[model samples]
Target: KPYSSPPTNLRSLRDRLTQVAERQGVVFGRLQRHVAMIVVAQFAATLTDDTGAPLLLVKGGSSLELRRGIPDSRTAKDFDTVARRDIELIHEQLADAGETGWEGFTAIFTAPEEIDVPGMPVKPRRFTAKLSYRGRAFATVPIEVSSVEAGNADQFDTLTSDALGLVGVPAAVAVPCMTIPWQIAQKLHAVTAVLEEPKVNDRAHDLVDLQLLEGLLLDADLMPTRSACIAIFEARAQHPWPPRVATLPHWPLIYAGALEGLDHLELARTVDAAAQAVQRFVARIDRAT
Candidate 1:
């Protein structure tokens, strides 16, 4: 709203916006809000009361956020995790940093509507933010907790950290994320379960991610071994298809052309090829635990 010195038509607002969002996760002008969430998570790690240990990054798109060096447009939506006590820290810090929060955990933040959320495992929640773009709020950038039980993070087996960088949280004790096989299997399940979701865009996004990860896995990019997939596959009988790994976080948004070329058949080829490649050992990931 201020005049610039010798300004021409218009410069990149995103560069400046990225600066602010990258510092403290202001979800305004935010769709792929990974950078915002990353900054917020970094700052939240400094929360004096909560130990950063229990925060296990589950179904969020942090994988590609940092993994693929995706731009602001490609940043993740949800900051989904499985930790209990201490989200108070996120609210406290974001507020101090001048960013706003939504109604509750249901709709914690308002972001753009086109980002990806690695939230296939978690259950969708209900909440809306005070902010609205296009006259409606979006959960593209959200803070989601998968569980309330303090020690539930430990129930997860196969949690490991290797290739992709880990968070630098100094808050709690442990911050484990999904193993590679776990991510792969779940992504495939996401493709199969895409239609189950109300949002067609979610399905399309899932297909893209599934395809990307398949390429990455086949090329031996990530580290979860084939045996890991086998383990999860054997355990599939005990688990449910499109496994609900934990409590979900945000509701999906409806977007136009959400399922354009990204139809279920395309997703089927992607998922089927992946399943066949892994010898069906990568069908469902509940075996990971």
Candidate 2:
């Protein structure tokens, strides 16, 4: 009597998410699993042209595996993207307030002109889902989104070249995720964006993420270099809620310390090693140039 019969739409939503959770060995509740499933489905659906061509972009946490032998700690209410124009298309698709939407849920609004984070005031779109019972809400799931500000064809192709296909989501060749390098760069900056205490400590989760990413980078030998780190950052820096910044200031120190815990020493070593590798390659290019 306390819980009303969930809407018909909820049945399928539950089914799809449960399947994905099992596949990923995820143990979260219904709302979270559903969020990832919805992100993959919706993103995969929106990426096609009339000619049925697939345009792809990045997939955020929970939807991806931050660790290979283990599961991911990255979780989200919504999914992430980096396709400039396609993000616009997705915003349009979700912003359609006219629809009944998922029958069991209530929608407040779609992020049209908003930014959920600071320093990187991408002011990206964010939405929420709530289940209420007995005049009280039992659960709330917030889906946040990210997108590129500009559509630089070359940059898009270069950055996304390593995107990996997601598991569980069906026919999602268009729903590839950012490479570990791109993913780690993202979480690293997200940790750097805010520079205050309690607020900064709040991102301890992100910090741990950088820690894991650092390890992953070393394992994959994809440890980023001084010269190459900016290539990915530039793509994210292209736009903002206020538009891309003129400067982000000394992000390398931030990157080098991304692994602050393992004493930040691991990243320091890898950073140096990666830097040396970069230098040698640049010298090799010097003669040709």
Candidate 3:
């Protein structure tokens, strides 16, 4: 093979991205996400805990992408991770490593900001990481990190950069991520919890995700998934377990947003149908629990 160089600037990188999109029949945005995950994996591979376990376990919508590949318009813009130890240690270690660059990408993480999430005991912090390709700014990935209490103790799953290979990124990176059952349970608890807050609730994406996940569930996953859901609801939800039927007054508009630009139809096409679909999923969970 000839010794070909990697992308040197944003222009070249995007060109490679376009080539991969055409070659693999993947959309441009999905290709960008593939690159973002590679960067994220490289970034997380840098630090470790006391026992050298990866310091960060990917969470939130990004976890869904890694675990089960959300099949709709509910793409994640930022990355989320849960800290295994004190976040101060993460900051200290990251600072000690001066300039952090991997796989031809440089990421500079800003100071953390503690953000409020309703029903969460310990607030999660947000960091806007500036990711550049060979010194040229490319993307800003909002890295949100929460304490262990807000997350499950599931063993981490690895997010690999094999997907980025499609876009000409030959360097492989691997980072730990949340498991599928835990991720689904967390999403389910979050969606159910938010339905109670009428004043501050618009999670049509969560509904869509739950609907999409329904088909992916397996018999082996049911027990652990149900247990995780129960634990999460007990720790994080304001409402009772076996949450009351989800009542979304404005789901029509929100459902419409979920359907936007999605290639697949034949899903719940109407708002009422969508609402029923979610309720059906919830009912299935209740029975399994």
Candidate 4:
């Protein structure tokens, strides 16, 4: 019933990402990912539960990336959301948006399938939505819906395509995104947690994200953010509270891979620089403990 086709818009975006990549010396795919984010975020922003609450609460890397500005360098991989209602209702709302707001293109969604992730209290719902023009699929955005609450409060971020506008999306979408403090807290835990299998390179993206957050966040935000980190660790932590890592194994290779789509000036672009970036963030958070 569905298939993956080469993304149609990448032809035009190729000029953008490649031009930016060559001029900026970053990797390709940043602009493409940002445009897809705008599409999905605009779709999600239009959905609300019967009680008037939003059906989907967008968070994770994508949220941060959008808040920071999609046209900016960092590229998040996929959509991560917290479901406020049943998965079916969210899907129904998305279907509605497909008909109404999605003007020039068609959006197709697979049924939400429960994902198997060990040690997580709730199994996340993972689904793929294909955005096509006429009959040819251009982009597929994978969305992972989690049951975890946003720990702290949520805030709205205005997602604008701006210079990176796509065919179907023309307007700005103000979506509920996780607050910087809360997201930074989660990233702190994500980067430091001791995994059962200890897949060495899994937290690579988290490191780069932390690096970006360090530069973007101010000193005023640090104490509150550190408090959030401690709270998160107390609630659920594989390691001790006030998360710490003696060393990041295989960090050099992981750092190299993560540098692809990020702005070299905005973050620590070298492996040694990445290490120091994470260290600075960790040290700031550890001030609470």
Best by lDDT: 3
Better of 2 and 3 by lDDT: 3
Query: Model 2 TM-score?
Result: 0.49
Report the number of the highest-TM-score candidate: 3
Assess each prediction's global lDDT (C-alpha) against the native: 0.38, 0.41, 0.68, 0.65
- The Cα RMSD in angstroms, rounded to one decimal, for candidate 1 relative to the true structure is 11.2
Once superposed on the true structure, which residue ranges of model 2 sit more than 4 Å away at CA?
1-40, 49-56, 63-74, 86-88, 95-113, 116-122, 128-141, 149-174, 193-201, 215-228, 232-289
Candidate 3 residue runs with Cα over 4 Å from true position = 1-4, 68-73, 94-98, 194-198
Q: Write the per-residue lDDT of candidate 3 for residues 203-287, one digit (tens) a residue.
A: 6667666766665565454766677767777777577667643647776788788676564735776667766787776667667
Query: For residues 1-289, could you state the per-residue lDDT of candidate 4 as single tens digits?
Result: 1112322454543555456545544445666566666677778877875666666777787877766665443567778987666647777778778656454456777888887554456677888778764455657888888765435544444454452332323345567776677778777777776666645436766777776676667655477777777777676645666555434657768777877745535766666676566776678777753
Q: Higher lDDT: candidate 1 or 3?
A: 3
Q: Give model 3's TM-score versus the native structure.
A: 0.86
Q: Give per-residue lDDT, candidate 1, residue 159.
A: 27
lDDT by residue (tens digit), candidate 2, 74-102: 43445455544444565555444213333
Off by over 4 Å in 4: 1-29, 70-72, 99-101, 150-153, 163-169, 198-201, 261-263, 269-273
Residue lDDT tens for model 1, 154-176:
43332222111221112232224
TM-score to true structure, per model: 0.43, 0.49, 0.86, 0.78
